[PDB]
């Protein structure tokens, strides 16, 4: 449905993965020798576009972005 893109400016705050209500994000180890970790977006079907992660990321401009796209039952948050 949506597309959550994670850019190079991450620093491993782990704030995005916590703020996500639907657990769309995950912190994975980066192949960078001195880079501790980096975020990920493995289960993007469950994104609900609430943009909490964009509010959490403390970079000058956000390392993470949520681009709106094709909607569905899960993305629109319809229990019915």
């Amino acid at each position: 449905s949506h597309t959550v893109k994670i850019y190079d400016t991450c620093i491993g705050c782990t704030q995005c993965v916590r703020a996500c209500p639907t657990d769309v994000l995950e912190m994975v180890p980066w192949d960078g020798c001195k880079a501790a970790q980096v975020a990920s977006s493995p289960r993007t079907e469950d994104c609900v576009g609430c943009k909490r992660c964009e509010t959490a990321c403390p970079t000058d401009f956000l390392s993470i972005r949520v681009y709106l796209g094709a909607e569905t039952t899960r993305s629109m948050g319809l229990a019915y």
Partner: peptide
């Protein structure tokens, strides 16, 4: 998916939808 929580790093996971360029 694995026993570890999403916040704590685990080797089995792999980065996805990573843009090496800056925004």
């Amino acid at each position: 998916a694995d026993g570890v929580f999403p916040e704590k790093v685990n080797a089995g996971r792999e980065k996805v939808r990573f843009n090496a360029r800056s925004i």
